Amino acid sequence: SRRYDSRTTIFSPEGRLYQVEYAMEAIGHAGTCLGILANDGVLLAAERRNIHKLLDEVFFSEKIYKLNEDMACSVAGITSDANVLTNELRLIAQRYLLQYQEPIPCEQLVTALCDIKQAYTQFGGKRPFGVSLLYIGWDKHYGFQLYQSDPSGNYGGWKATCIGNNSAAAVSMLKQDYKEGEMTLKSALALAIKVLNKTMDVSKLSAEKVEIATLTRENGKTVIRVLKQKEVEQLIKKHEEEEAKAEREK
Amino acid sequence: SIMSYNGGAVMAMKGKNCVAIAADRRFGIQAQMVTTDFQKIFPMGDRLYIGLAGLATDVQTVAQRLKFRLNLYELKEGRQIKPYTLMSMVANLLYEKRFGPYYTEPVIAGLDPKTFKPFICSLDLIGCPMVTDDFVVSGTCAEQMYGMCESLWEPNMDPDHLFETISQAMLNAVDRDAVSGMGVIVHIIEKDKITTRTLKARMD
Amino acid sequence: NQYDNDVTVWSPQGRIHQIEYAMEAVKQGSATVGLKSKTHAVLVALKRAQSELAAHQKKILHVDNHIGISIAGLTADARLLCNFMRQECLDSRFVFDRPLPVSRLVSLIGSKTQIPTQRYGRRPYGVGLLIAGYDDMGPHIFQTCPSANYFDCRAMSIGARSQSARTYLERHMSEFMECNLNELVKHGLRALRETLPAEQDLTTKNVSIGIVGKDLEFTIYDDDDVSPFLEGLEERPQ
Amino acid sequence: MEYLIGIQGPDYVLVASDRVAASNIVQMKDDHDKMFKMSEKILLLCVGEAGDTVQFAEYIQKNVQLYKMRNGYELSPTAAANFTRRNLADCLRSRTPYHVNLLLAGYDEHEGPALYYMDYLAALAKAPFAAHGYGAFLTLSILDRYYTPTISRERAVELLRKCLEELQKRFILNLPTFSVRIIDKNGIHDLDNISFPKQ
Amino acid sequence: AERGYSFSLTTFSPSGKLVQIEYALAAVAGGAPSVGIKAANGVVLATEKKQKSILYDERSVHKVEPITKHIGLVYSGMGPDYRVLVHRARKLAQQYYLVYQEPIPTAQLVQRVASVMQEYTQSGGVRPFGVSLLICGWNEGRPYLFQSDPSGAYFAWKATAMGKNYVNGKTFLEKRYNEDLELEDAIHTAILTLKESFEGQMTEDNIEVGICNEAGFRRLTPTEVKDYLAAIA
Amino acid sequence: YDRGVNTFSPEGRLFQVEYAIEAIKLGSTAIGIQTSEGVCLAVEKRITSPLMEPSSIEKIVEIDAHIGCAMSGLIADAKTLIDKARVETQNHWFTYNETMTVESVTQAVSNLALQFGEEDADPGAMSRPFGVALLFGGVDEKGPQLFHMDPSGTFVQCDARAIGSASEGAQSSLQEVYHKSMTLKEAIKSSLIILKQVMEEKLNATNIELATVQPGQNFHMFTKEELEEVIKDI
Amino acid sequence: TTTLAFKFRHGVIVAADSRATAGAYIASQTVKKVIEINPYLLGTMAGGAADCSFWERLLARQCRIYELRNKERISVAAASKLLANMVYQYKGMGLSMGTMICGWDKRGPGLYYVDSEGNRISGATFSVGSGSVYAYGVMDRGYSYDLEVEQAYDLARRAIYQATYRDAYSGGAVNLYHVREDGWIRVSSDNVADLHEKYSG
Amino acid sequence: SYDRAITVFSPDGHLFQVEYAQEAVKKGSTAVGVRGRDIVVLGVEKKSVAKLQDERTVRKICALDDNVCMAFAGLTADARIVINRARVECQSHRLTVEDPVTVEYITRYIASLKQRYTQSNGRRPFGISALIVGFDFDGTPRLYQTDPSGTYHAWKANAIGRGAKSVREFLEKNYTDEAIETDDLTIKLVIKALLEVVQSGGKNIELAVMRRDQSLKILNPEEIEKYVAEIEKEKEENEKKKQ
Amino acid sequence: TTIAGVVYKDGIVLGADTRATEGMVVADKNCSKIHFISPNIYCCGAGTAADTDMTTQLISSNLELHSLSTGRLPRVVTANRMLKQMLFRYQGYIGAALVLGGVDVTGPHLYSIYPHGSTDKLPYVTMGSGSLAAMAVFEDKFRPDMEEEEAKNLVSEAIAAGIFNDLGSGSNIDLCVISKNKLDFLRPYTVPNKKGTRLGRYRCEKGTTAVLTEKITPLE
Known part of the structure; x- marks a missing residue:
């Protein structure tokens, strides 16, 4: 018994949790997923690894989970763990709603899940959840919001970020192009298309390969929509027709 | 009785391709009225409302936990809930407290979100479902409401006539009950729109 | 070395090393001896001091009016067992209003101590006991090992360098059954004495005595109440 | 026996309570306070059973303060009211129910002034004005007679005085003094006690 | 006496892999092959039920099992694990029916079963299931075909294959099959893609077939399978 | 190579207990002296920075008005035992209306000895021994008493005792200077002397703590000035 | 039983009778109804003797542990709150207890009434027991915050005395304690028979 | 449940898991704190200034109650846990006792918590250290610090995290009764200490102050820039016209 | 409520009325009291309506699981056992009174099941407030080995007796015929009861309600 125990909730000599880091490595080999904040909304854009000629497509999405009428999330890592965590997030949101009769602030939801993940890192002897998450939402306290959480139960708020394969490059590119206080949903969409176009291994980029969702505020209600393939192709074509435009100048 | 502690009345009525649900507005404690704007009808999706009469606490609580489970349903599955399914859900929720029941007798009224076929039902305090093709009632003035509904209800009624009928039934039944009234509210729902009205009523 | 660390692991030769290692804990303790006449049961124990400015370790504990013990090994396990025995005796007096038979108390100790020698992550009790008692079948001296085994002794000694005492006792067994109390305690003291180099000997500072009998409840003597026993011994010279 | 009253104006909430702590046939305390600060803009007026009132009220209070310390912002009067209502409703069918009747006064930066009424059965009801206790039976009507939604806080205090005077006239219980507080955009303000110099 | 190992047997490698899951998948890709085709008006599941002797009574154990009246299952990998998952799936379906008085949607059943599968990749003292599942169903007019793997992940397919030579069966499906097929044609191409591997004479007792139209899930009689295996009918 | 926390060495000892004993050898050294006029306890604070408030270092605490305790080793572990001892004394007072004997308190704390283990235990049980040595100094019906306890659970009465890193040297020095008829003044004096001998820093008023328990006076921790008056007579 | 307590400029006066009955039968006349919890904390006994004594003893234990742990002494408010919270968990089980916790604090003289029902209120004057109504009559007629110490003593003593006169379940002796900043002092323990001759003639 | 000894003794008498936890702390952002007369200031170093990140969501200076604030260094998640537990206990103290909370009390609670996690089956030590800062009733200002072991002490000034030794040395050399004679001087001392290990900026320094019965005050980068400016001025009006 | 069951030559006829009352007020005029257990087993329910509903549904579910696992058609003894053991466990607090009937490999079987958990296997049974009338009909006009239409007539007659002689019963008559190779879920059999035609038109015209x-x- 002491022999077979892999000891998953234990410090390493350098003062770190090996399983958490290895989980981060698992995340690194997952579909690229990024999120960008704006002044009139916030968006998620993710690489689709479920891209085969014989897939049936019965769901609204693949990596975009609706959590709440004012909140949505995207994921990267092991998908089943993502199903678990997303279900739990929904549960938490509904508990808050039952208790206070008003929507849960996004930060509170993220923290609530992150404490569970942390708990998994500290005791139990179980493997952690090989999953990182991006949260987009709106609330009456901080308006439009983008968050990110790691399997360590560690989270942070961002104006723009990426997660998954080639995340670092995407982050650098975002650091270049971003526009604090001067961001719009259109511009942010362009930026997403750009970074996704460079980071994705498979070039050219078909709508069959990307998945975009926006969260915006219309008439007192919160609207979350997944972009149809047509709009996506419009965005890509726009990107190429702008890229072939700046290359003329030489 | 426990049900008569706060009083109140809830009614639902079938139409052609429409449906109606109504309730009084009084929140009182025994003989004393506290408020005249108490909500007893709750939206459980587009074209699907639930009416709760009885003990006010359990009205609010059942409504809230119902919204809880319903939201979870509409998230796990990618669809609004069907009326029969909502009825079974409420039935389950109430029967979970078989030996310590919530004191409410719910009434469900809605259109099939896929079709448009009207659906109405009512349940026990322990969740025994009952579907009809005409009307359902629940409240301290049940006998009164039965009396009115049996004499006013016609089969294939249009929205306006369904409205007039359910309104007259509610008004005249409630006006013979001391712990029901202080206003009436009617939701008449059809395929394209939802009309919400408050009736001119006695306030005594 | 792979059959060393768990009590639930048999060795390929039919042994359990954790039990034996536990048995070794008895030998690390100061020696103690126990013998019986036909009327009395006596424990004699060589106390032991860390430094000169520290008192000598308690070796004899009271269990019930008719039962006392002498310990050898881990003192925590000793106090554990002691509390167990006390509680069992109290239970017996409470329910039956008669003193608990010594052999049954011992059997209970065996049962209790056997249990953790079969469960994973559990350890044997690291303590050996000598039990002096008197009941309807007369005086009794028992010996309990970490192996959860127990013995009905005519006399015995356990602890460091107790082989000598064992030999001496083995010589004078035939005398014991007819000895008087003074002579019995004497023999016990000599047995305890043979467990020492010629340089050191018994004192009113490093000896504890425990007696129980037909006319005497279990009693512990030390300090100056030991002097009447010692001052009556032959200055055995090298 | 205990009296609570709340009157909501367009941009303020006025609250008042009796100051008597009574047992048997004697008044044991005459400066008792029925109010509980829960936020900078929320008051909880609790009344009822001996130990249940303070236990419940303080539990709620420390939990609201906990929310504030954990999240950086305070609860809205609505979220607060539904919180206390949830707690009260969950204990209802338990071994340890709480016999408390309560008012919750508050001011939100968005939705404005709010007054909530709660029965001991945990039925929550928003109202322009409310009252708890036997005295309510003699005061509510007066409010009904003289309340208008645009009532000034001065007129509100005058009306309050009318109710309390009525209490002095018809009510068999003593009740000589009354705690009076008011909540607005700037927080909770203590007003002079309404008293009737008997002896 | 017994308690239980409370630590994970499935852990991350430094490469970031859940090794036991991939070894489980290795166990799947060593079992008899199975094919599933969604065909407009119905769904077909078929598998190689090849025994090891004439002594085996093939009319006793089945690989194509019903979950309810409208949902069916086949697998690739270890049998006993599959059996466990079948019991569990049936139970889940019945719980759903007790709560909603409405037959369980195929996708919901798939999600719940997948959750059960995920548990055994993280809970203590257990290994993951060595089974991939193909689940067919009829709900809300449309037909449905899902696959769930030992990680607890699931995918919706128009058509697919699992087990031995699942890659070549998959390609064969990608070419020699597409939409607007009636269930009959689908059965035809299903037995056809199974035949791309079934070493030996493929009889009516060498394979098992199940169908799912809007009349319910059912296992095909050996007679019907013979008629189909006449390279005709 | 990892084995259970309840594993025996071939010598017949528990590895964890022995390693805990080893862990004590890093602790601040402490001295206790028993005397018919009272019991004294002295310990070095070991301040590692001028920025550290030394008054927040208490290696001597009051178990009760007639019992004090000096601790060495892992102080964090000691706090638990101290609290348990205090609670024990208060329970004894509650039940019997009389104070605890020093030996009884010591025994009580010693009952938490080998109460550690993995399998077959509560989910809130200790995983390892306490890495701490204790010196209880008290006054009761048997007069002034001083006891010593180690992670083995074995507790024993002592006339003069030293625990800590410089245990051996200090103990020898104590042996050379102790007799069962000293005054409390001679005891305190001796303690401070040997302490200064073994301490690496220069002995001063804000560098050690000293406490006495006398038959006529409750547990007393010496103030800065009271310490100065003693250090004066070096 | 008749107990009273009031706080004034110079501290807290605590007084009690000493009679204990079992029905009409007088079981004792030597009951210490002022409970010395601490050298700085006084309680009173009304209702069930056992309940008051036991729970306030538990209180004393808790207060001592508090003093050891926090190196400071508990406040009157924290003590009364502790007692109230302890007693509240047995609500409806039949505990009969009406006590007054008196002390001196950072906030000065403290006086709290604590019930077995759940009450816990701070105040200037209190009286508990079957004779409380009678004691209130004289105490209220004589009370002032600016009373002199001897005046306070005389007031408390007289109130308890008149209470013994009217109430059949109160009598024996009048015991009187004074809580000052440096702790409490046992002021007096006069017999009712003596007080009769002192007061009437 | 999981009942395995994680933290055990080594042959040399060390608690390895606790030491590794302390290493984890040593990899943390530098946090310092100093105590003044009517002011107490805490400042934390590297905020991982990604600039694409919301600073508010990554602050390492929290408030436990209106009375007590705290900084930390180590594993941010563990810190979140300990912080929230400390908050609950801060409120429960108000429930069980009419009086609020002393800094030493909450410090003791947190410390005992960590120690408990060093000695319980299945659990793993919190890999954080905390700087607790407050003003108790009676007005005495106090600063304590805890450790993954469970040990805790009072300080006049201290630092934790990456390069804690350096800043500790600096503070040892600079803490006087002349410095921290005014609020603006104590804050200045904190910024001066932090700039001795930070990558030399001012946009990389978070600073919070508490004073009297007033609430915690976080300093906006404008005020911080101003203080660092007067700092660089005094570092060129008393250090330039001399050397 | 009036429910009955009978055993004939080729199987079993179950009968029920359709009135659901709350107190002494009719709530439902067309309540379904004949419940599906298994394709070959059906159950009429009287007593506490919710309890009969949930009991019968639970047993139906467990039996579907059972037959799904066994691959065979459920037996009536199984339903009887499950029901009676569940009910006994709850000591009558589950107010389910049942008429259980079905056809097996062993043939047709009819049990009556009481809320305390006692059962009786009988060729004819009645339950409910109208049970004595129906039982009278049976005891007067029952013969063993009847034919289908005769049995249907007998049962409908008993249910009618209940309907017209019991205030708890009324409205329509439902029959369920179960044979070795047929299932006739006639609902309803024959409504011997009708509301009289409306003499007036109490129709309110638009605008009459303020x-x-x-x-x-x-x-949308």
Whole structure:
């Protein structure tokens, strides 16, 4: 018994949790997923690894989970763990709603899940959840919001970020192009298309390969929509027709 | 009785391709009225409302936990809930407290979100479902409401006539009950729109 | 070395090393001896001091009016067992209003101590006991090992360098059954004495005595109440 | 026996309570306070059973303060009211129910002034004005007679005085003094006690 | 006496892999092959039920099992694990029916079963299931075909294959099959893609077939399978 | 190579207990002296920075008005035992209306000895021994008493005792200077002397703590000035 | 039983009778109804003797542990709150207890009434027991915050005395304690028979 | 449940898991704190200034109650846990006792918590250290610090995290009764200490102050820039016209 | 409520009325009291309506699981056992009174099941407030080995006796015929009861109801 125990909730000599880091490595080999904040909304854009000629497509999405009428999330890592965590997030949101009769602030939801993940890192002897998450939402306290959480139960708020394969490059590119206080949903969409176009291994980029969702505020209600393939192709074509435009100048 | 502690009345009525649900507005404690704007009808999706009469606490609580489970349903599955399914859900929720029941007798009224076929039902305090093709009632003035509904209800009624009928039934039944009234509210729902009205009523 | 660390692991030769290692804990303790006449049961124990400015370790504990013990090994396990025995005796007096038979108390100790020698992550009790008692079948001296085994002794000694005492006792067994109390305690003291180099000997500072009998409840003597026993011994010279 | 009253104006909430702590046939305390600060803009007026009132009220209070310390912002009067209502409703069918009747006064930066009424059965009801206790039976009507939604806080205090005077006239219980507080955009303000110099 | 190992047997490698899951998948890709085709008006599941002797009574154990009246299952990998998952799936379906008085949607059943599968990749003292599942169903007019793997992940397919030579069966499906097929044609191409591997004479007792139209899930009689295996009918 | 926390060495000892004993050898050294006029306890604070408030270092605490305790080793572990001892004394007072004997308190704390283990235990049980040595100094019906306890659970009465890193040297020095008829003044004096001998820093008023328990006076921790008056007579 | 307590400029006066009955039968006349919890904390006994004594003893234990742990002494408010919270968990089980916790604090003289029902209120004057109504009559007629110490003593003593006169379940002796900043002092323990001759003639 | 000894003794008498936890702390952002007369200031170093990140969501200076604030260094998640537990206990103290909370009390609670996690089956030590800062009733200002072991002490000034030794040395050399004679001087001392290990900026320094019965005050980068400016001025009006 | 069951030559006829009352007020005129257990097993329910509903549904579910696992058609003894053990466990607090009937490999079987958990296997049974009338009909006109239409007539007659002689019963008659190779779920058998035609038109015309407030909400 002491022999077979892999000891998953234990410090390493350098003062770190090996399983958490290895989980981060698992995340690194997952579909690229990024999120960008704006002044009139916030968006998620993710690489689709479920891209085969014989897939049936019965769901609204693949990596975009609706959590709440004012909140949505995207994921990267092991998908089943993502199903678990997303279900739990929904549960938490509904508990808050039952208790206070008003929507849960996004930060509170993220923290609530992150404490569970942390708990998994500290005791139990179980493997952690090989999953990182991006949260987009709106609330009456901080308006439009983008968050990110790691399997360590560690989270942070961002104006723009990426997660998954080639995340670092995407982050650098975002650091270049971003526009604090001067961001719009259109511009942010362009930026997403750009970074996704460079980071994705498979070039050219078909709508069959990307998945975009926006969260915006219309008439007192919160609207979350997944972009149809047509709009996506419009965005890509726009990107190429702008890229072939700046290359003329030489 | 426990049900008569706060009083109140809830009614639902079938139409052609429409449906109606109504309730009084009084929140009182025994003989004393506290408020005249108490909500007893709750939206459980587009074209699907639930009416709760009885003990006010359990009205609010059942409504809230119902919204809880319903939201979870509409998230796990990618669809609004069907009326029969909502009825079974409420039935389950109430029967979970078989030996310590919530004191409410719910009434469900809605259109099939896929079709448009009207659906109405009512349940026990322990969740025994009952579907009809005409009307359902629940409240301290049940006998009164039965009396009115049996004499006013016609089969294939249009929205306006369904409205007039359910309104007259509610008004005249409630006006013979001391712990029901202080206003009436009617939701008449059809395929394209939802009309919400408050009736001119006695306030005594 | 792979059959060393768990009590639930048999060795390929039919042994359990954790039990034996536990048995070794008895030998690390100061020696103690126990013998019986036909009327009395006596424990004699060589106390032991860390430094000169520290008192000598308690070796004899009271269990019930008719039962006392002498310990050898881990003192925590000793106090554990002691509390167990006390509680069992109290239970017996409470329910039956008669003193608990010594052999049954011992059997209970065996049962209790056997249990953790079969469960994973559990350890044997690291303590050996000598039990002096008197009941309807007369005086009794028992010996309990970490192996959860127990013995009905005519006399015995356990602890460091107790082989000598064992030999001496083995010589004078035939005398014991007819000895008087003074002579019995004497023999016990000599047995305890043979467990020492010629340089050191018994004192009113490093000896504890425990007696129980037909006319005497279990009693512990030390300090100056030991002097009447010692001052009556032959200055055995090298 | 205990009296609570709340009157909501367009941009303020006025609250008042009796100051008597009574047992048997004697008044044991005459400066008792029925109010509980829960936020900078929320008051909880609790009344009822001996130990249940303070236990419940303080539990709620420390939990609201906990929310504030954990999240950086305070609860809205609505979220607060539904919180206390949830707690009260969950204990209802338990071994340890709480016999408390309560008012919750508050001011939100968005939705404005709010007054909530709660029965001991945990039925929550928003109202322009409310009252708890036997005295309510003699005061509510007066409010009904003289309340208008645009009532000034001065007129509100005058009306309050009318109710309390009525209490002095018809009510068999003593009740000589009354705690009076008011909540607005700037927080909770203590007003002079309404008293009737008997002896 | 017994308690239980409370630590994970499935852990991350430094490469970031859940090794036991991939070894489980290795166990799947060593079992008899199975094919599933969604065909407009119905769904077909078929598998190689090849025994090891004439002594085996093939009319006793089945690989194509019903979950309810409208949902069916086949697998690739270890049998006993599959059996466990079948019991569990049936139970889940019945719980759903007790709560909603409405037959369980195929996708919901798939999600719940997948959750059960995920548990055994993280809970203590257990290994993951060595089974991939193909689940067919009829709900809300449309037909449905899902696959769930030992990680607890699931995918919706128009058509697919699992087990031995699942890659070549998959390609064969990608070419020699597409939409607007009636269930009959689908059965035809299903037995056809199974035949791309079934070493030996493929009889009516060498394979098992199940169908799912809007009349319910059912296992095909050996007679019907013979008629189909006449390279005709 | 990892084995259970309840594993025996071939010598017949528990590895964890022995390693805990080893862990004590890093602790601040402490001295206790028993005397018919009272019991004294002295310990070095070991301040590692001028920025550290030394008054927040208490290696001597009051178990009760007639019992004090000096601790060495892992102080964090000691706090638990101290609290348990205090609670024990208060329970004894509650039940019997009389104070605890020093030996009884010591025994009580010693009952938490080998109460550690993995399998077959509560989910809130200790995983390892306490890495701490204790010196209880008290006054009761048997007069002034001083006891010593180690992670083995074995507790024993002592006339003069030293625990800590410089245990051996200090103990020898104590042996050379102790007799069962000293005054409390001679005891305190001796303690401070040997302490200064073994301490690496220069002995001063804000560098050690000293406490006495006398038959006529409750547990007393010496103030800065009271310490100065003693250090004066070096 | 008749107990009273009031706080004034110079501290807290605590007084009690000493009679204990079992029905009409007088079981004792030597009951210490002022409970010395601490050298700085006084309680009173009304209702069930056992309940008051036991729970306030538990209180004393808790207060001592508090003093050891926090190196400071508990406040009157924290003590009364502790007692109230302890007693509240047995609500409806039949505990009969009406006590007054008196002390001196950072906030000065403290006086709290604590019930077995759940009450816990701070105040200037209190009286508990079957004779409380009678004691209130004289105490209220004589009370002032600016009373002199001897005046306070005389007031408390007289109130308890008149209470013994009217109430059949109160009598024996009048015991009187004074809580000052440096702790409490046992002021007096006069017999009712003596007080009769002192007061009437 | 999981009942395995994680933290055990080594042959040399060390608690390895606790030491590794302390290493984890040593990899943390530098946090310092100093105590003044009517002011107490805490400042934390590297905020991982990604600039694409919301600073508010990554602050390492929290408030436990209106009375007590705290900084930390180590594993941010563990810190979140300990912080929230400390908050609950801060409120429960108000429930069980009419009086609020002393800094030493909450410090003791947190410390005992960590120690408990060093000695319980299945659990793993919190890999954080905390700087607790407050003003108790009676007005005495106090600063304590805890450790993954469970040990805790009072300080006049201290630092934790990456390069804690350096800043500790600096503070040892600079803490006087002349410095921290005014609020603006104590804050200045904190910024001066932090700039001795930070990558030399001012946009990389978070600073919070508490004073009297007033609430915690976080300093906006404008005020911080101003203080660092007067700092660089005094570092060129008393250090330039001399050397 | 009046429910009955009988055993004939080729199987079993179950009968029920359709009135559901709350107190002494008719709530439902067309209540279904004949419940599906298994394709070959059906159950009439009297007593506490919710309890009969949940009991019968639970047993149906467990039996579906059972037959799904066994691959065979459920037996009536199984249903009887499950029901009676569940009911006994709850000591009558589950107010389910049942008439259980079905056809097996062993043939047709009819049990009556009481809320305390006692059962009786009988060729004819009645339960409910109208059970004595129906039982009278049976005891007067029952013969063993009847034919289908004769049995249907007998049962409908018993249910009618209940309907017209018991205030708890009324409205229509439901039959369920179960044979070795047929299932006739006739619902309803024959409604011997009708509301009299409306003599008047109490139709209210638009505008006759005064309205204080209106609010139209467009959907999609």
